[PDB]
Ligand SMILES: Cc1cc2nc3c(=O)[nH]c(=O)nc-3n(C[C@H](O)[C@H](O)[C@@H](O)COP(=O)(O)OP(=O)(O)OC[C@H]3O[C@@H](n4cnc5c(N)ncnc54)[C@H](O)[C@@H]3O)c2cc1C
Ligand code: HEM
Ligand code: HEM
Ligand code: HEM
Ligand code: HEM
Ligand SMILES: O=C(O)/C=C/C(=O)O
């Protein structure tokens with residue numbers, strides 16, 4: 001067969017997959033996937049037949065109900081979504097190499113003669129709020145607005161939900177939570193505020209950070225009330241105390257949080273449309289939003305009439321060309337992001353009249369696994385790992401900010417460093433088992449062996465750990481002044497993860513006020529237009545603190561959802 005449909009049509013009718021009229025049920029291909037499931041079983045059940053020791057196409061960390069058509073198209077060869085970050089040994093029938101080729105919003109100007117057509121038609125739907133983007137902000141905003149009584153349509157341009165949010169690992173910052181107090185941590189919203197302002201070099205908009213710190217405990221409560229487990233509280237860089245909340249044992253905060261929001265959305269029957277890209281915010285003749293034109297991958301262009309559009313589209317850290325224009329030093333770097341985190345949501349906010357701010361501050365995460373091409377959480381260092389260079393020496397306060405950590409690693413020989421930890425660190429953070437599973441955490445029972453495996457002087461490495469452990473014992477890092485020394489690295493085996501900075505987060509984005517309203521260049525609110533999450537600028541100034549983005553998208557998404565419901 002040349003394609004999956006052709007393969008099946010040797011012994012099946014078209015309506016084995018299609019509706020009776022043959023029309024695609026919708027852009028999520030809900031009906032069609034239901035047919036794949038009716039014969040092949042759920043994803044879990046498919047997974048059983050495709051196990052590999054350390055990976056499985058059908059049993060991934062992606063939350064929500066991942067459609068089969070996310071990777072298996074019927075009438076054309078299709079791409080494996082995991083190939084956008086990994087290079088696992090897959091043999092998907094009818095596959096084609098991963099290649100993201102999505103027109104920019106500007107390029108879709110080529111469809112004027114179909115967009116105009118769409119805009120002249122009746123709206124496909126009429127609701128109160130359209131939320132664009134199914135990351136943490138979008139889901140929060142959809143839920144929020146629905147809880148407030150608004151009818152929402154939540155759209156997602158990828159075949160899968162979660163954006164970058166589902167990849168999040170280290171934690172969601174919040175101060176003065178019950179979760180913290182359960183752990184004997186003392187903190188305060190003013191402390192979180194102060195950490196964030198200095199972490200962002202005082203570029204941050206103070207009123208936005210006030211929302212961020214003051215709403216954080218509320219955001220953690222809200223999530224917890226929805227089913228989230230944010231009881232593990234870890235240390236992230238640039239933080240005075242542990243406040244990065246995450247699931248018990250130190251599991252990824254992101255997949256979990258997005259999973260909860262998704263289940264909550266499903267429970268509220270929120271209309272969630274996959275393969276549906278927001279293209280252009282529609283304004284009436286008085287300049288308030290009147291809807292949004294979207295491009296359904298299978299239904300084409302259509303618009304939704306709504307009083308409020310909440311842009312929750314994430315950042316542009318995967319778009320290296322845009323990143324390079326704003327920060328020429330990040331050009332050619334690998335990104336930790338999902339494939340569609342390319343800034344099309346900012347273009348949509350900009351075409352609507354939203355002004356942008358702080359675009360030039362683009363965060364590189366210091367520790368992208370060299371081997372794996374994926375983010376290794378800062379929580380690894382927060383929980384006690386150290387960084388060592390090829391020379392086998394520490395060279396930086398590993399819990400400093402992402403900007404200082406990146407520059408320090410890039411100044412090491414080979415422009416990469418090694419996270420070094422033991423079984424005590426491993427065991428304190430379950431997320432580290434995911435890296436051992438990826439094959440990116442080589443291990444050995446001695447640092448000499450470990451260094452010889454990775455090309456780190458073993459004897460230097462061994463002295464470095466012994467030196468580090470002493471400092472942990474004495475309670476002060478006089479070498480690099482790492483202010484939190486949670487654990488000696490002397491339990492069980494030792495592990496090394498080769499790391500180098502990757503593009504990660506765009507701290508710049510659409511200008512919003514404390515009600516998450518998008519402002520134009522003359523600082524005027526554009527009625528009905530809201531922005532939440534990484535698509536906004538001003539929250540994190542020049543350097544976002546680890547944990548603050550997940551705090552931010554829940555806080556701002558919830559807030560946008562409420563404000564929009566209310567605005568109506
Ligand atoms: C690998 C990784 C791990 C991270 N770990 C952490 C962590 O522990 N703690 C932390 O604080 N931060 C962490 N971060 C940062 C944080 O996850 C992100 O900032 C991300 O969650 C921002 O959330 P968001 O809702 O704004 O956008 P995202 O979650 O990126 O979601 C936005 C959605 O919008 C969709 N979209 C975009 N444009 C359009 C359009 N025009 N139409 C329709 N849909 C559109 C995108 O496809 C995407 O799904 C991590 C980021 C990465 C990449
Ligand atoms: C878009 C929807 C579907 C997807 C993504 C899908 C997935 C797949 C794939 C990847 C294969 C292997 C093809 C090959 O080896 O060349 C396959 C085969 C098969 N499919 Fe599907 N399928 C879908 C719908 C269906 C439906 C509706 C039925 C039955 C009515 C079905 C029954 C089968 C059978 C019987 C086989 C051969 C092997 C087997 O499962 O015993 N599939 N399918
Ligand atoms: C000869 C038999 C079939 C015919 C004539 C047919 C017809 C079509 C048409 C016209 C479309 C595009 C609809 C649009 O763009 O609006 C489509 C898409 C689609 N069809 Fe089929 N179909 C057939 C069999 C199947 C089978 C056997 C499957 C799955 C095993 C399937 C699954 C799908 C899916 C998932 C889509 C969305 C796009 C894609 O993945 O290619 N169809 N089909
Ligand atoms: C219930 C949802 C899905 C169904 C029914 C389906 C169906 C299938 C089937 C029948 C096979 C052939 C494996 C075998 O049985 O020999 C397969 C293989 C495969 N599918 Fe799916 N699939 C689904 C979802 C997905 C998703 C979401 C992705 C990517 C994340 C994916 C990517 C692949 C890959 C990469 C292979 C080859 C497995 C390997 O080489 O280990 N599938 N799928
Ligand atoms: C269905 C699609 C995918 C599959 C099956 C998959 C598979 C895996 C596997 C097997 C691991 C090792 C730990 C574990 O077992 O979870 C892993 C880790 C990881 N993957 Fe994926 N991957 C997929 C897609 C992606 C994509 C598209 C990205 C980036 C956008 C990504 C980012 C990561 C990261 C950052 C890690 C490190 C551990 C963590 O944060 O949990 N994965 N993935
Ligand atoms: O877990 C991490 O390393 C990333 C955190 C962040 O980007 O906030």
Ligand code: NA
Pocket residue numbers: 315506507508509533534535536537
């Ligand atoms: Na931003």
